[PDB]
A paper describes a structure:
SpOatAC crystallized in both the native and SeMet derivative forms and crystals diffracted to 1.12 Å and 1.8 Å resolution, respectively. The native enzyme was refined to Rwork/Rfree values of 15.0/16.8%. Ser438 is engaged in an H-bond network with His571 and Asp568 and the triad is positioned in the center of the putative active-site cleft of the enzyme. The oxyanion hole structure in SpOatAC is distinct from other SGNH hydrolases. Whereas SpOatAC possesses the Ser nucleophile and an Asn in Block III (Asn491 in SpOatAC), the conserved Gly of Block II is replaced with a Ser (Ser461). Moreover, rather than forming a type-II β-turn, the residues of Block II in SpOatAC adopt a type-I β-turn resulting in 180° rotation of the peptide bond. This orients the backbone carbonyl oxygen of Val460 (rather than backbone NH of Ser461) toward the active center where, together with the carbonyl oxygen of Val462, it coordinates a water molecule (w1). Another distinguishing feature of the oxyanion hole in SpOatAC is the positioning of its two component residues, Ser438 and Asn491. The Nδ2 of Asn491 is positioned 3.4 Å from Ser438 Oδ, a distance significantly closer than the average 5.4 Å reported for the equivalent distance between the homologous residues in SGNH/GDSL hydrolases.
One such target is the enzyme O-acetyltransferase A (OatA). This extracellular enzyme modifies the essential bacterial cell wall component peptidoglycan and thereby makes it resistant to the lytic action of lysozyme, our first line of defense against invading pathogens. It uses a catalytic triad of Ser-His-Asp to transfer acetyl groups specifically to the C-6 hydroxyl group of muramoyl residues within peptidoglycan. The overall structure of SpOatAC adopts an atypical α/β hydrolase fold, where the core parallel β-sheet contains five strands (β1 - β5) sandwiched between seven α-helices (α1–α7) forming a shallow and solvent exposed putative active site pocket.
Author numbering: 427 to 605
Write the structure that this text describes.
Amino acid sequence: GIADGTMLIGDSVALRANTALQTALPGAQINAQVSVTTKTANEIMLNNSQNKFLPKTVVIATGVNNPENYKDDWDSIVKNLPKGHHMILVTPYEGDKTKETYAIVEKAAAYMRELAEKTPYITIADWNQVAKEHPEIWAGTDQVHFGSESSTIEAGAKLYADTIATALQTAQDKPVKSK
Ligand code: NA
């Protein structure tokens, strides 16, 4: 089967948390890039699988950028998860409730929760919920990229990383996709 291991395919928010992620998950493969969307994460996931580089646990840390197509994008990436893997979906957070995309990001997070609740080989990492509980990391920010100063960047990054680490713990006794 697929070798154990974790690969995170992530967006600009994941990239901001890169140091905290690597500290919380030593030995995880963190592939986060500014421009990544759910659409391109799906492509990256399959390219890695096809080159035999994708380990068992796949963390998709996307959703806030280009959120309009969330239903099709999240349905597709779940459908395209290869056999042999467990998937962690990191919900997105747009904090500005007046942004024209806010309702879309909120619907995307809710839809991802539905996919995780119903699919035995998926676990949620509910950053959307965590972010809402910590207004202090959003003071002075663009409401997406946590922390406006050194201390709150570190604090927000730790919260982000710990959300994913906890999801990985929850996933430990769960099945992979199999036929
Ligand atoms: Na599940």
